[PDB]
Design a protein around this ligand. Structure first.
Ligand SMILES: CCCCCCCCCCCC(=O)OC[C@H](COP(=O)(O)OCC[N+](C)(C)C)OC(=O)CCCCCCCCCCC
Ligand SMILES: CCCCCCCCCCCC(=O)OC[C@H](COP(=O)(O)OCC[N+](C)(C)C)OC(=O)CCCCCCCCCCC
Ligand SMILES: CCCCCCCCCCCC(=O)OC[C@H](COP(=O)(O)OCC[N+](C)(C)C)OC(=O)CCCCCCCCCCC
Ligand SMILES: CCCCCCCCCCCC(=O)OC[C@H](COP(=O)(O)OCC[N+](C)(C)C)OC(=O)CCCCCCCCCCC
Ligand SMILES: CCCCCCCCCCCC(=O)OC[C@H](COP(=O)(O)OCC[N+](C)(C)C)OC(=O)CCCCCCCCCCC
Ligand SMILES: CCCCCCCCCCCC(=O)OC[C@H](COP(=O)(O)OCC[N+](C)(C)C)OC(=O)CCCCCCCCCCC
Ligand SMILES: CCCCCCCCCCCC(=O)OC[C@H](COP(=O)(O)OCC[N+](C)(C)C)OC(=O)CCCCCCCCCCC
Ligand SMILES: CCCCCCCCCCCC(=O)OC[C@H](COP(=O)(O)OCC[N+](C)(C)C)OC(=O)CCCCCCCCCCC
Ligand SMILES: CCCCCCCCCCCC(=O)OC[C@H](COP(=O)(O)OCC[N+](C)(C)C)OC(=O)CCCCCCCCCCC
Ligand SMILES: CCCCCCCCCCCC(=O)OC[C@H](COP(=O)(O)OCC[N+](C)(C)C)OC(=O)CCCCCCCCCCC
Ligand SMILES: [Cl-]
Ligand SMILES: [Cl-]
Ligand SMILES: [Cl-]
Ligand SMILES: [Cl-]
Ligand SMILES: [Cl-]
Ligand SMILES: [Cl-]
Ligand SMILES: [Cl-]
Ligand code: NA
Ligand code: NA
Ligand code: NA
Ligand code: NA
Ligand code: NA
Ligand code: NA
Lengths: 311, 311, 311, 311, 311
């Protein structure tokens, strides 16, 4: 079977729609997500036209192999989608209504700059290649675009699922390609990060700051170095669920800042001890008393600067 | 083959049944489980009717390709089920009895609020999309719903496998859809959590509390900070088997509370030392003696409040 | 093709045999193992009977599609087996001899009560569902049951591969189902657990007991708390390769007992220090001297009691 | 269908092209990457030639089964590629234009000598085996070689995708083989390694160096040994994402050098203490004062030597 | 299609050959490897004889389904190989030349006794089962056995790929089976183990030995116990990439020996302290001075004995 012939020289319009049934496995490190959806396609094939009077039927059902069907592919998929044809219906005028249910692993890049208080626009790119006989063009049937209310993406809030109605028309391997952009806007559920990562990091940092109320170097060394090891465990835990980015992320900047604060607290502990041994405890006492205010104040200010730069 | 024609304008009833053979791989983090079951379907096709006296046969066996079979799908599956047709039997009145054995990975959300003392209702949603010729509606044959006695879901107790007999009939993309809810009620075997997680956390907490019977700051710092590191290892171990939730879980609340208790014990250890250095051991002794009772009492009370709020 | 018709009303006997070629991937946590084997089936089909004089052949080879073959499935499999028909042969009396080679992931529950000194009976359940026309029942051809000498299951000793000759016949959805139990008896190679887990745990426990020959609280705290952290690493390492059981395992009981011993050694270290500070070293010396004998003696006795209860 | 017959004894030229749509999952440890691309093939089949005026059509479309197609394979793939034929077009002279879209996991070795400041040349080898009737030879159509602007390989910069135009024609099992080398030049985005690995390693090293301003052996031991444990954590974290190489890598050399520096700092700490105990603090003070300059200077010089040897 | 009939009563010889294209993923823990190779088969089928004058061609090409092909399987594979037929060429006498390219995961046991300085002989077992009509026997065509020069197995050196030319013809389930052994001799690239595992273990052991130059029990306890924890991390790292063996491995023996050395160093540290407290520093000094020589000497001797016993 060849494509439908044109009445004049107009392109063949394939109306499309994606109805999301499931959205799962958003892998941040892999920058992929899995989707289970309906793909609806509609186009006119005059060769399939019939008179409902002489036929006795108002609609005709067909098998995919019996008629011409446009080769629609997804651009940003790992492997070709797994699809199952649900229905193919032809109306008297020859308007074909195709419906399939598919599952696919989608490759969509993520911006981790504001992580874990980030939002993303996931893309699903639909494409059709033109044939020598005629130019095939994609369109969006907005009445056939949507998502199930039960669609839950673990650790994310689904804001909207819309399509950019105008296709991207360009040449690829000496043939025209029509590309539609389906956009799934999501925002991260940051809740869990506060009691599980943010607050534990602060607690161990505040424990390291008790060294500013102690003159015992041996105890101070234990306090700062042991809390540093606990911080390193949290840093490793955090960075393992993120890919390596060529830019600084919000969490990355915080982690880096905390390393500086631990390093400076070691300098203070070292300086205070050196002075006490040099029989200068009065000078050490002045530094330690200043540190009690300076460290929390500089920590709060540095965080305000960071939050400002990132948000 | 087209669907059976109606005698009057009634919808076509497809009687369904699921008999669980196996239940395995309940992934908490992924909120998925694997199922191996029988799917039984039954409907009337008058075109397949015969005389049992003339035909000499009481039943006729058919191949799937030879007759019309409703397209039944699962809503909450990763990929389409892997099915093998076991039998297709037609009775003289034309009643078709279809049986297949399938395996599928089911997506079902879990409520971790009461974890690890939680119970879940896992769902298996059966669906049929109506055709242009006629409306297809689902029903439950309770005599064909059940589970194998040997069905074991590692770390869970299987309470019941029932079906909500009334289908959810709704319009989806200008066609009727008939959905059935099969519910598998399970409860977590919390046993192991007590000797492996709960009791070890308490032991290391009680070890940190020996600092209330010591005046040695250096030893106290070692006790509280080393036990905190051991607690962090347990917290990481626990939270790795749970997904990130937009709500507080029972275990999460306990873990958070323990962080506060460790932080307050550091404050006590710090305060006691500051007083001893300031030549005020009498005041420190009063605080340390109070801490010996206050810490276990406040720990027990806070746990009673938490258990009350969650259960 | 329909099943062979009965001479009288007798059920159709399908003789079976499983010859193990490979046994691999015994996953304890998943309670699954992978098998690669031959499945032999044999039954009489009188419609296939012939005269070897007239036909000039003593055996007839057939393609699966050409003749009736019983639908044999495995009960306890993740997904349906991956099978390849090797041969189908018919003798003059109509005795069919079928042979296939298959691979399958088998779900078989394990008893971890005596771990790592445990033995298991892995099961492979063959099943057949009776048809409308006649009742099918399974049997064991013992001459066709066996295993290759090279069959190695990493970390296990293979004791025997036998079949329970009488099937477990029963009704499932108003049809006879004939079930055969193939049992693979295995025992764990416990060797490695001794130098890798058992002896390291004892060494670090004995190191913690050197605190009974020291009066230095700061050193004692370091000894007991550092060895506890090392023990926690071994406990995590051990429990990660085991599933969560609703019963106590031998290793679990040992791990729990060691936690008590560490907790009691902290109590001793704390008590000894409190007395020395209270200017009572004579009383502390009596306790520490008693501990030197009491701890190893109670440890040995508690282990004898545990080994007795579990073995 | 047999291959096209030669006009004279010339080999059959199959013009090739690869257009990269997606590049993902560059696994360093596995030395593999996943590719989703277009494979274009073009060759002359005179049997397929036609008159454009007589046939009325300027281009004829064919199904793969209808015509002869060369068996093209990839040399360095895990499994055979997953391909979907997009188009097959024949021009009047019999020039066939084939296009498929494929996905494949490519095995390509990596040079980790300069890691994480390394660049790689990933290879995709195209191969054809000659037939008994005629010799098949490969060629590159440069107009059909390229990549999508959006092609992003996480943690890498894509420099170029070119093909070595001269094929490697060699005998293999008494038949000609024609191999083409497609080269994807990439360079690692080293950014993240600086704040996440390099700077943390330096901070903990500088903390260990505060022992050169302390006379307290107990504190010094804690400083050097605790920071060594933190370094071991980073070394394990680093080496887990790299395969075991039969050569030294840049990161490996740095890690080894840091071990020496920690070992030498322990020697210093030990020597200083031995002298103080031997009532020689003047000699110890000379060594510790020298160490304050010697350690950072030798560290900087050793790093300059290493960077010179590796770059 | 049935097998070729014999001219006399001779068995049918199937000449074989394996040409390795790729060797990857040698999993030590799983005792598997992945292979991508050519499988060449050759046998005579007189029924396929043709006159090249009448057929117009000197060599016939066939589709697998069109002619009789021996059922060749691999014994030691996880699942049946993934194969793609490259060519089937029949010459006028009826000599068939079959070629396929396959990928398979091979199960081959490994001897870890000399790990990481071990060598292995990986096996690929080819098998054919005889039919009812005639006995099938395998042979090796040495001109069709080999490997690609580029064949790289990460972390291994490939020594040779040869075949044991004499098949193992044996009875299995009342039929002849003909088995060929293809042996891939490999040796481990031990390089990386020296700077990454061996030397770090020695450095931390030497750090623990600085306790023999210290009289400070609290510092000594910190030194020996902290380095023991670092050693435990290396032991876990090492043992995780090895399966549980029912024998002692070279690395296992070293790891066990190091535990003894750490345990004995704790005994020394404990004894030395007990004597100093008992006002006997002269006796302690004699033990500590002896330990400075005894520990490195006994360590070197024990390693010579171990290397001798294993190599
Ligand atoms: C007054 C002392 C100021 C110290 C400032 C330290 C700057 C460190 C720069 C790091 C650059 C990144 C190399 C780091 C060694 C640790 C420094 C020890 C300080 C000792 C203080 C002695 C008190 C007299
Ligand atoms: C130490 C680390 C402290 C982290 C502070 C949170 C960062 C933050 O304040 O994040 C802010 C984001 C919201 O960002 P947005 O409004 O969508 O940005 C767009 C803004 N424009 C349009 C003006 C550019 O989330 C919150 O309000 C959650 C606050 C969590 C508080 C954590 C308490 C501990
Ligand atoms: C004579 C003292 C006996 C101590 C017995 C301790 C019982 C602990 C029960 C745990 C139950 C699970 C809560 C645990 C706090 C640590 C106890 C510190 C003991 C201090 C001893 C002081 C010596 C006068
Ligand atoms: C009487 C002392 C009360 C201390 C209360 C501490 C409040 C901490 C608030 C945390 C906010 C969330 C920033 C935390 C630094 C550690 C505090 C050190 C206390 C020193 C006590 C000195 C004794 C005279
Ligand atoms: C420190 C951490 C302390 C944790 C204490 C256990 C929580 C608890 O008491 O949990 C309570 C749950 C039972 O709740 P349920 O019957 O399933 O809820 C439904 C009830 N309604 C419908 C009335 C709301 O489990 C248990 O029986 C706990 C037994 C284990 C005690 C472990 C002690 C150590
Ligand atoms: C501290 C932890 C100590 C662990 C001690 C091993 C437990 C045990 O003694 O286990 C016992 C099992 C054997 O049991 P079985 O014969 O198979 O039981 C069936 C018995 N019936 C038929 C009578 C019921 O292993 C052994 O042969 C012990 C070898 C391990 C030595 C440990 C060296 C350290
Ligand atoms: C002279 C003392 C020799 C010590 C030998 C120790 C042998 C240990 C045997 C382990 C068997 C495996 C149980 C181990 C407890 C630690 C021993 C503490 C030694 C204290 C020495 C006091 C000096 C008078
Ligand atoms: C402690 C570890 C310190 C590591 C220092 C980086 C090594 C380096 O200086 O690496 C050098 C590479 C660049 O190499 P290239 O020019 O692309 O090589 C090709 C050269 N040929 C073709 C001429 C041979 O990285 C840089 O641009 C340095 C940026 C990293 C700075 C890290 C700061 C800390
Ligand atoms: C002046 C002392 C120089 C020390 C040199 C140490 C060389 C170590 C060689 C390691 C080879 C790899 C075996 C290592 C034991 C630690 C050495 C303790 C040194 C004690 C110094 C006492 C001061 C008088
Ligand atoms: C502490 C750990 C000490 C490890 C010592 C290396 C073991 C060894 O010397 O291993 C020996 C193997 C070679 O063995 P082979 O010749 O292949 O065996 C066949 C022998 N027959 C046939 C006679 C039985 O490798 C080497 O040359 C090791 C060199 C690396 C030394 C690392 C130093 C640090
Ligand atoms: Cl697709
Ligand atoms: Cl489904
Ligand atoms: Cl099966
Ligand atoms: Cl029954
Ligand atoms: Cl029955
Ligand atoms: Cl390929
Ligand atoms: Cl195979
Ligand atoms: Na079509
Ligand atoms: Na059908
Ligand atoms: Na059949
Ligand atoms: Na310490
Ligand atoms: Na073809
Ligand atoms: Na064949």
């Amino acid at each position: 079977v060849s494509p439908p012939p044109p009445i004049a020289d107009e392109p063949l319009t394939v109306n499309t729609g994606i109805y999301l049934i499931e959205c799962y496995s958003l892998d941040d490190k892999a920058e992929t997500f899995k989707v289970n959806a309906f793909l609806s396609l509609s186009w006119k094939d005059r060769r399939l036209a019939f008179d409902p009077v002489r036929s006795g039927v108002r609609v005709k059902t067909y098998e995919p192999e019996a008629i011409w069907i446009p080769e629609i592919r997804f651009v940003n998929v790992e492997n070709a989608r797994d699809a199952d044809v649900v229905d193919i219906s032809v109306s008297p005028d020859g308007t074909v209504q195709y419906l399939e249910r598919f599952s696919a692993r989608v490759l969509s890049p993520l911006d981790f700059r504001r992580y874990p208080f980030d939002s993303q626009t996931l893309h699903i790119y639909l494409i059709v290649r033109s044939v020598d006989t005629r130019n095939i063009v994609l369109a969006v049937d907005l009445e056939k675009v949507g998502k199930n209310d039960d669609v839950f993406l673990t650790g994310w809030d689904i804001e909207s699922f819309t399509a950019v109605v105008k296709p991207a028309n360009f040449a690829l391997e000496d043939r025209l390609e029509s590309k539609l952009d389906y956009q799934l806007r999501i925002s991260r559920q940051y809740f869990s990060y506060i009691p599980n990562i943010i607050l534990p990091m602060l607690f161990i940092l505040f424990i390291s700051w008790t060294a500013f109320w102690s003159t015992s170097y041996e105890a101070n060394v234990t306090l700062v170095v042991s809390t540093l090891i606990a911080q390193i465990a949290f840093n490793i835990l955090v960075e393992t669920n993120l890919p390596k980015t060529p830019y600084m992320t919000y969490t990355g900047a915080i982690i880096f800042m905390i390393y500086l604060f631990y390093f400076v607290a070691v300098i203070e502990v070292t300086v205070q001890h050196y002075l006490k041994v040099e029989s200068q405890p009065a000078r050490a006492a002045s530094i330690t008393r200043a540190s009690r205010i300076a460290f929390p104040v500089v920590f709060l200010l540095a965080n305000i600067i960071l939050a400002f730069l990132f948000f």
